[PDB]
Design a protein around this ligand. Structure first.
Ligand SMILES: O=C(O)[C@H](O)[C@@H](O)[C@H](O)[C@H](O)CO
Ligand SMILES: O=C(O)[C@H](O)[C@@H](O)[C@H](O)[C@H](O)CO
Ligand SMILES: O=C(O)[C@H](O)[C@@H](O)[C@H](O)[C@H](O)CO
Ligand SMILES: O=C(O)[C@H](O)[C@@H](O)[C@H](O)[C@H](O)CO
Ligand SMILES: [Cl-]
Ligand SMILES: [Cl-]
Ligand SMILES: [Mg+2]
Ligand SMILES: [Mg+2]
Ligand SMILES: [Mg+2]
Ligand SMILES: [Mg+2]
Lengths: 414, 414, 415, 415
């Protein structure tokens, strides 16, 4: 048994660009699928696969998943980055898919078997003020979601190039207002870290008053404030007992978590942005987070994700893999096979899928009253209809939201 | 190109003694200006320039700014002090001014270009009680200031040699009273650290009640209390979410910040007094402050200030350079060129200038609704009219406020 | 006033090694910047990261705002801090510094603080199959005027190389290194013996000191080829030979082992040609775990971040030794040297000779005389590219072979 | 689909050493798993822990949920983390992995990541009464093709052994070791002299390096027989002889002393055949206090936790050397080797020869040729047990004598 062909498929059935890898073998009908999706970079990841990892694999036995991972990881010398890791993930997940197909077992059966019979999900809710958020959250709870991420506005702004309209809305509502900008300013999506941070604890006081303490509430700070203001936020949110506060610092600010954890008892999630062991390992070792957030394709696939899950397990840290819309259904299944086999599973973020995703990727997990139920089919239990995928070509482009500027025009980590 | 002459100009157009350096070259009309202002020491700084750095520079190429800085810094062997550093600053800023003039670009363009289109300012407000402070702050907000430093009284005293009158005013107002002094006591400006510290959180509760949470409020403890009482103050101010609490300890007490930062989430600013890397570096390394306050002439000018700004940047710490009245407009421009080019700019302290400063130093930045807008002229964009400067001779003398005594007569770091 | 009108990537290999170069055009006729994006093993992924993303991102922007462009380009794809991302950013950043110097009429070193020295001290590579060949090579470098010499015997791990992608030349393996026997079948790869390599090294340096003396400075690159504890023993065993530095005793993924190493050994340590992330380099510099920072500056994102790392090192007493072998363009060589001229903490500059084809394709390459490099005084990076001639040296591309490095039992090692 | 129908324990001693084996039957005719529970000194307490507790706990359960069974069996008695508890859990866990591979039609190494090497490197034991006997023994092992050799002189503490429970053979004491005199009466025990032992060791290794050279890798096991500070001195004194590792310089109860040792010595350190608890092994791996983790995998609870410890080690740059002397069944030997094949961080595999009786009772034992082991490719652990033949080798049982180790004054020492 050996690898005959490796290709990349770029498709966007859910309206978000995805990168999928298919590895073909010399056994008729036996192939594996993997997720490479770094949505902002699809063409650079495609090159990293098609021009490099693809020819590197031809003629090799797919059974040596670890040897392939280790040798591919260093094949370009330099390594540990989101383009390199996503390319590696596409390969690695496809090789696990093939191993499970060869075994006649789902990948979760190879990784230790089921530790639970359903995967608990959390979903996003939002709104422009605390009543809109309350109503959005209540509607998700009525659908059976028991864990809800609640966001309000866009980090103190409106998601536009100007703060004046939202500031006037805040004046009228008697709420905290964002700052006035200089008389001319650079293009970007303007926000206000100070108005945002000062507003957050009142939002959660309101949600607890209205929704109660049974439901689990989550909040994502998304690296939007200074570290000391995040420490203060984490402390201010303690009375509301959030399931977690996510990304209070940028990866480049991870040293500030030592101070945060000497002060706050709010649980902390970090790491959708992580690409490098020197980011995640010291946080797990030192108990500086309670949930590891990696986007598994950005750390290189199932092989490294299982290692990070175990490293976390032995430190008492749980998993919450990143899984919003920019992940393919193959990556959603990979997250959930790890989730099922991990003693330390924390929670699974979920973005509801449309009909097109379900038809382009047969095998998507079933969602019923806030839990996901993955199928029992071998490998990752997921397929791709290549002809129907080709009917959803990718948009490409440079996203606008990643130019995020504070009121004075300063570029911030978005 | 080489340095022909170096001179010091002592002038006080704003009523505060300034020390300015002018370096002339062999190119007609090309000269540079720098700020040496240590206002309490102008004659010692003048000597350190005129008798030492001036003859050291004659005939040297001004293009080697770093070589000149490093060699001047060690020229007297002993180093790292406010007289030595201010003399070095006058030279260094003038050399940057010449480099920008030679380039035809503002110094901010050499330091990485603009990161924002206006410089956010904070201004001082004060009053004898919480209503006076509220009114003073409101008047600055109406002028367009979005960041306000609020002080009340003078650290529990009246700014006089006796506490009895202010104590009686406090009795009548039903407020906390300063202590009675011994029956005879040494001359000085008496204050009361205990009355001061215990009064501060109520001041900010009042300002938040009246002014709201949109405006940013700052407070300067100015090394006036014991370290443990500063830790307690920082904690007590948390509910009021100050932009920062400044100088909770003296430079000689920097080891106490390790304890403060294990307890409080109030942001901390330190360092207008710093002269030495062994002061600022461990605080930045260990995340013990959120804003670095250096008076840039006291650390040796633009060259070291840019290094401290970068060292801070990579630790997540922002800049707030010291800039009250004892700084020349050349130093104000240098602060603002660093501010414009620093990703990590925090805030810029500002003391409004009179007509005399604007006429003696053509090129002062424009202030409009709480932001400063520096001009685009080459170098530091600033000049000095030597004839008009000579019409504002310096006062000199020993300031009285630096003899600060607690109620029992103890000299305190002022 | 100025604005960016076009951004393009040029792939060329005049020195036998694939390079990636960026050219940024402005609206001022004849004013353009050049930068180095060279991650040689990935040139097509870097080319995409520039052409499909950073190029359209820049069009119409004022090139004067170098820092605002660096910070915003760095986060434009959200995920960041990796070799393809950073090299693309470097090509942009260096070209913007080139434009700034040309606008100013000054070399980039003049914008960065001016000259701190009048020549840049170089170290060069010597190798050989045995201690005598290494000795003869080093003696020749000394005769040519080099005062700092890196000495390997069989390059990295003792394995030499058959892969032209590394140095553009085959290098013979260590001839007397007596590796352990492999199992009866084994996977394809370039085999080396870490134990035999580590033991060979103190003997090599004893011989070199015996024959060449202690005036010359001698360097060695362990190139992450041994376990951390064996690297600690090697650092200690080399102490009597007073190396200028021992380079890459650990992989980036093993940086936590340097705390132990530095409690034991006084041999100076260089690290970091592989570094892509602040969480790699910052703790080592903060904790005095290295004496020389080795970054390949395009892999950290260009001149803007390199200057910051040089300053962060300076304040910690650490010096600079930027990575500069064959896989760097002459644009990158000039950027290294402009930093070197303006840094008080300059340590040493690695150098491999630039052939005539490189010098023709890139007018402005530094002059080398008697162990020092002399950069010209022209504005910007003082370097140009002849696009027509660059096209005559199309890139080889492909997957390198030397990066499949296996120990005797067949284990993949970080190469 | 499958469910567990029977669980039993088999006690057998074909190699002259008491073994504990678990067999788990399913509802599918002919599909069963085998596992290793061998804590040789306690076989009857382990047998009870399986037969009276874990066996009834498992009946009717789906063997596919290996992790859920491990986690739940581990806590089923509340108290946990000890050698009787963990060995019982291991017998279950290995048998469930055996069943998983048989269900999949694949060796367990294929489920764990596949092969990272094509042979497993072995080290073997040499001993002797004096330096010349040790030399002759080691030279013979080298001639047979072994590249890694552990060298003792009088086994542990220099005392040799009269107890067949250790190696199934008497071993002569160090003949020239000149112990201190005991008091005029003393308690029964196997006497040894820690001071005379420690001093003998650097002399032994000087002689071996003089006679055998530096290509071969040499190992030594201090077996917790000396005080921590004397072990620190021994680690330092061995540095010139470049041992592959020095094993068990401290008892598990003395692990806090390794911080001091690692600030001083560069001799590589192996620890942990005695470990039963995460609070023993985790801090050592986190803090880089060892280079090789030595667990007896049945004493840590089987393949499930061993894979986790191997991964935790991998991310810390620590390698695996699983304990594998005579008191382990061939099932346990195969489990060690399946982990070894699939771990990037494999260090070395201890090996003691398996006699014909062991090979007959356990069909499928690995082949050994020229210093490497070759596991077969059959599904599961690739190992079986002939119950009829196993019954022909009933266990000896009893209390071992070698574990009463006393210093010259009569003090009980951790043996
Ligand atoms: O928690 C999350 O789901 C993330 O923060 C997303 O909101 C990211 O912003 C997005 O995945 C980037 O592509
Ligand atoms: O924050 C400030 O502006 C300072 O604390 C000033 O108030 C100093 O007291 C003065 O600059 C000394 O000369
Ligand atoms: O010190 C050096 O010069 C390096 O180690 C190079 O030899 C790298 O191996 C090469 O640059 C990789 O492409
Ligand atoms: O390294 C080794 O192989 C061990 O130290 C064994 O010799 C143990 O003493 C034995 O396994 C105890 O039963
Ligand atoms: Cl990358
Ligand atoms: Cl027990
Ligand atoms: Mg998030
Ligand atoms: Mg102050
Ligand atoms: Mg190197
Ligand atoms: Mg042992």
């Amino acid at each position: 048994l050996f690898i005959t062909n490796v290709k990349t498929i770029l498709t966007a059935p859910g309206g978000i660009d995805l990168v999928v890898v298919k590895i073909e073998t010399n056994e008729p009908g036996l192939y594996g699928l993997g997720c490479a999706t770094f949505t902002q970079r699809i063409y650079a990841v495609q090159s990293a696969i098609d021009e490099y990892l693809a020819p590197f694999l031809i003629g090799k036995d797919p059974a040596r998943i670890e040897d392939i991972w280790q040798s591919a990881a260093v094949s370009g010398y330099w390594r540990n980055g989101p383009v390199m890791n996503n390319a590696l993930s596409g390969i690695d997940m496809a090789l696990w898919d093939i191993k499970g197909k060869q075994a006649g077992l789902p990948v979760y059966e190879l990784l230790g078997g089921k530790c639970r019979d359903g995967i608990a999900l959390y979903v996003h809710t939002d709104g422009a003020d605390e009543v809109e958020v309350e109503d959005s959250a209540r509607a998700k709870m009525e659908e059976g979601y028991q864990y809800i991420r609640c966001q309000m506005g866009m980090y103190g702004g409106a998601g536009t190039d100007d703060l004046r309209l939202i500031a006037n809305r805040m004046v009228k509502a008697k709420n905290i207002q964002p700052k006035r900008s200089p008389r001319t300013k650079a293009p970007g999506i303007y926000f206000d870290p100070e108005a945002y941070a000062k507003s957050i604890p009142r939002l959660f006081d309101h949600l607890r008053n209205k929704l109660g303490f049974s439901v689990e509430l989550l909040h994502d700070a998304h690296e939007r404030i200074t570290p000391i203001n995040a420490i203060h936020m984490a402390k201010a949110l303690e009375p509301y007992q959030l399931f977690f506060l996510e990304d209070p610092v940028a990866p480049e600010n991870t040293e500030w978590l030592k101070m945060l954890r000497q002060q706050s008892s709010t649980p902390i999630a970090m790491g959708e942005l992580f690409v490098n062991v020197n980011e995640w390992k010291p946080l797990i070792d030192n108990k500086l987070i309670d949930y590891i957030r990696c986007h598994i394709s950005s750390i290189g696939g199932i092989t490294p994700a299982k290692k990070i899950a175990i490293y976390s397990e032995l430190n008492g840290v749980r998993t919450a893999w990143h899984s919003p819309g920019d992940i393919s259904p193959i990556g959603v299944c990979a997250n959930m096979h790890l989730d099922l086999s991990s003693p330390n599973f924390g929670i699974q973020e979920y973005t509801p899928m449309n009909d097109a995703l379900r038809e382009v990727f047969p095998g998507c997990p079933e969602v019923d009253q806030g839990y996901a139920y993955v199928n029992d089919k071998p490998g990752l239990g997921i397929d791709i209809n290549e002809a129907l995928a080709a009917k959803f070509p990718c948009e490409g482009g440079n996203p606008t939201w990643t130019m995020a500027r504070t009121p004075d025009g300063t570029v911030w980590r978005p």
